[PDB]
Amino acid sequence: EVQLVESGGGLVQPGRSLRLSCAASGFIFDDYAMHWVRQVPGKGLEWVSGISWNSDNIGYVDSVKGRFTISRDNAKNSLYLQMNSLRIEDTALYYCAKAFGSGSYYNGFDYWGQGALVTVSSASTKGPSVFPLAPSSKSTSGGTAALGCLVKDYFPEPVTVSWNSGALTSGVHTFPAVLQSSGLYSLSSVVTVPSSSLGTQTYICNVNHKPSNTKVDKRVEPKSC
Amino acid sequence: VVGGEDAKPGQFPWQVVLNGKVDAFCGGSIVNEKWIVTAAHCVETGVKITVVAGEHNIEETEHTEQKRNVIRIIPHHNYNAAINKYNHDIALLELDEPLVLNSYVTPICIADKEYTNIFLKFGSGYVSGWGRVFHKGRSALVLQYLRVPLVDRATCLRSTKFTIYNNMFCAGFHEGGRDSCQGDSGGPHVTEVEGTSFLTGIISWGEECAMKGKYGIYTKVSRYVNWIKEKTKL
Amino acid sequence: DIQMTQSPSTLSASAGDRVTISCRASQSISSWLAWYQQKPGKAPKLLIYKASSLESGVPSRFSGSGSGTEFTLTISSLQPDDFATYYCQEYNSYIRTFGQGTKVEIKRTVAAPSVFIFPPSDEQLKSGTASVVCLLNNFYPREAKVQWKVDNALQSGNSQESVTEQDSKDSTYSLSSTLTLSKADYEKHKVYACEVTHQGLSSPVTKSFNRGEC
Amino acid sequence: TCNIKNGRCEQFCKNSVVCSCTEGYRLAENQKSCEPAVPFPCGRVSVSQTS
Ligand SMILES: [Ca+2]
Helix, strand or coil: CCEEEEECCEEECCCCCEEEEEEEECCCHHHCCEEEEEEECCCEEEEEEEECCCCCCEEECCCCCCCEEEEEECCCCEEEEEECCCCHHHCEEEEEEEECCCCCCCCCEEEECCCEEEEECCCCCECCEEEEECCCHHHECCCEEEEEEEEEEEECCCCEEEEHHHCECCCEEECCCEECCCCCEEEEEEEEEECCCCCCCCCEEEEEECCCCEEEEEECCCCCC | CECCEECCCCCCCCEEEEECCCCCCEEEEECCCCEEEECHHHCCCCCCCEEEECCCECCCCCCCCEEEEEEEEEECCCCCCCCCCCCCCCEEEEECCCCCCCCCCCCCECCCHHHHHHHHCCCEEEEEECCECCCCCCECCECEEEEEEECCHHHHHCCCCCCCCCCEEEECCCCCCCECCCCCCCCEEEEEECCEEEEEEEEEECCCCCCCCCCEEEEEHHHHHHHHHHHCCC | CCCEEEECCEEEEECCCCEEEEEEECCCCCCCEEEEEECCCCCCEEEEECCCEECCCCCCCEEEEEECCEEEEEECCCCHHHCCEEEEEECCCCCCCECCCEEEEEECCCECCEEEEECCCHHHHCCCEEEEEEEEEEEECCCCEEEEEECCEECCCCEEEEECCCCCCCCCEEEEEEEEEEHHHHCCCCEEEEEEECCCCCCCEEEEEECCCC | CCCCHHHHCCCEEECCCEEECCCCEEEECCCCEEEECCCCCCCCCCCCCCC
16 A cells, blocks of 8 residues: 655754655655645644656745745655754654545545654753553553563653564553653553453563663563552 | 537638647738737747648648748747646747738737737637647648637636636536647637627646546737737737 | 734534634735644644645545635544644745644543552651652543542642643543642651542442552 | 627737737727738638538
């Protein structure tokens, strides 16, 4: 099927530059126009820039006109976006969108990418700390247990948590991060399992933090209490 | 022309066929006794073209024909074959000897800048040529004409991935069937008013021929009227 | 340029209901309007294009209507899976202005929470911090208050809450309340409890533990 | 004036409301119409289209 994979996101200081890459697959890249759409948490969805099928028609939103540059590589099936003189107002989730139907430049989109988070700030990258929320008699309720993992003190967003290398999804709840007074984020991810399947089954949370290159597996053994 | 009717002898006296590497490959229109208009993509660098006027059947001889040769090819200065093959698609053909007008050969009228856009806004336009009757099929032997309605610009851009520029308009029907094809390019798109005919378009291109969603795109002669009158003056 | 206005900002409805979302344009965009649905954490997916056309693969319970300056979206027979934010977008201009979006909540029966608690790990205690996590799992509605008690003393000023979004299957909620104290202040007391009051709870449920015993 | 029915003219309109014609024509009967002034005027079908 049609798939668009973003890359090149992260954290950068005001006035610096990155370069997003959107790799297209599953369709004729030459017969459709491509756009960049950002989701500003205060504003919402906003079309940033668009390019034609052969880099002929190029349009920019007035806020980035003169700072952003859009290009495509039909041989490599990739769309790029070059941000320059980044301001704190440019912080958003940058989606990759492809026009539907006839692939016209003035058409709406029918397929969006996974997005690439861009955070423009002066704060430094800080890796998280994973602490086990161990199950015990105080985390049960008649045959049902509750265990989890704690991701503490990281910057910036986001942090993804998977359980048992992705093979454990039923009953998983990964809470949205909170902001602490120190500027760093924190979240917890829990899962409810049978209280009898405690000590015989294995539960390992896989925590990921891209800006800090953090990949941690933590075993959650029951705390006998 | 796809889905077109046969033209009666003399119904379009301004029609002109172009011959060169391949006989009857493009069309044209008579400006006056010495100048012909055609699409710039029909004549490139170093082209051996001859112009035949007063033609009805290509292979038949009706004694109404006037064969001439081109001696000066004038393409628009803003035309660049390396950039876009249809951006500013217009050209001027100066003949070796001035023609003499009669009943079967007659120039087409060209208004000024403002009015040429007004005549186009009427909606109805007529196109004619000797091109292909079917998509990648046989070519027409007799002149085929077709009436086409002007489609709005907003619908035309959303119908194709290729870019449609300001000096180009689109025309055609929704369910396909009736549209120009390859070979018709270079000829006239004309709208009539109280009998008199005024040139308003040149067959430029389109996606295939006669298909739902696609429309024939034409050249806006209104943007080049001042350039036509100044270069073809006597 | 063109101001897109969606109505309502947010609405809540039960399963099987008929939802109507409006989207008004400041000018006349003819029929150049598209409807997108974005589920939490997921990318927006095209639903209805050209005001009334349905994208291949989209269920037939979604319907689009409207022309000119007023457009409406209709979801016949609401399903719990349809919890998302719905956006309207015009593509008449090259700016392609989106609407403010409309969040569709699901209304269901009252469900009481299951209260759990987690003592701080010894790995974190050796770092100079203690985090106590109280967990409210699979409840409805979202209104639920959590009060921490340290040695039967109401604590205030050292806890933070966080609520998940509506579940895609049962449309329940889950809340996290973490009590964070330093190691110095954590050892100054013994009992740590988490009190919870909810619509589906006849009496406040309290889960507690003793420091040094867990 | 020229905005209502082209100012009663047949080809060109001008407010000073007067009318004009293209080349090869002339103001017909001094009214707002255009008549041929050349034996072979432009944009006209002169051959018989009978049968
Ligand atoms: Ca002949």
